[PDB]
Amino acid sequence: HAHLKSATPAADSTVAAPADLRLTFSEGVEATFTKVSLSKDGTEVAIKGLETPDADKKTLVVTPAAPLAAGNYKVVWNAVSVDTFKSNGEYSFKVKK
Numbered sequence: 001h002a003h004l005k006s007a008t009p010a011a012d013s014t015v016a017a018p019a020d021l022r023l024t025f026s027e028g029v030e031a032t033f034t035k036v037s038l039s040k041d042g043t044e045v046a047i048k049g050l051e052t053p054d055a056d057k058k059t060l061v062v063t064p065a066a067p068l069a070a071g072n073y074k075v076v077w078n079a080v081s082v083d084t085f086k087s088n089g090e091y092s093f094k095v096k097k
Contacts, residue, residue, distance in 0.1 A: 004091070007022065022059050022062075028057030031049070
């Protein structure tokens, strides 16, 4: 099972808007089969297809379709690991103007 070790922006951080979100897991994850829901104050934020840039597939990149405006974001993730276990979790962060 893939478990989330760290993310950028970090959980409970307040940051300038990030270019994308990067979730680093304890096991490789499958970008095709993993799903992420990004929302702000209870409204869906559109994202692109997911990606794992590294050979080991341990960092998942979530790219918003348009730049992130200020406010309170929630990330709900549903990972499929490279050994094909499903796991899920969630966290939040804030974007400042």
